[PDB]
C-alpha cells in the first residue's frame with residue numbers, strides 16, 4: 100500500500116475538506132478530491148463527469164479550466180506531480 104505526502108497546493112486542497120494529516124494513501128487522496136468536487140459542486144449539472152475548475156485551487160493544480168473524471172491519466176499526472184511517494 101503506497102504512502103504519499105502531498106506538496107503544498109495539494110495539501111491546501113486536502114485541508115479545505117478537513118484532511119489534515121501529513122501522509123495518505125492514494126485511495127485517500129482521490130477520495131478527498133472527490134469530496135472536494137462534490138462539496139464545492141464543481142461538476143457540470145447535466146454532464147456530471149465534467150469538473151469545472153477555472154479560478155479555483157483545482158484549476159491551479161490541473162492548469163486547465165476543466166477536466167473529466169473519465170480522464171484517469173490526466174488525473175494520475177496531476178496527482179503524481181503534486182506528491183512525494185514515501186515507500
Ligand SMILES: *CC(=O)Nc1ccc(NC(=O)C*)cc1
Pocket residue numbers: 169171
Ligand atoms: C458511468 C461511467 O462511465 N463509468 C466509468 C467506469 C470506468 C471508467 N474507466 C475505467 O475503468 C478505466 C470510466 C467510466
Ligand SMILES: [Cl-]
Pocket residue numbers: 154155156157
Ligand atoms: Cl478556490
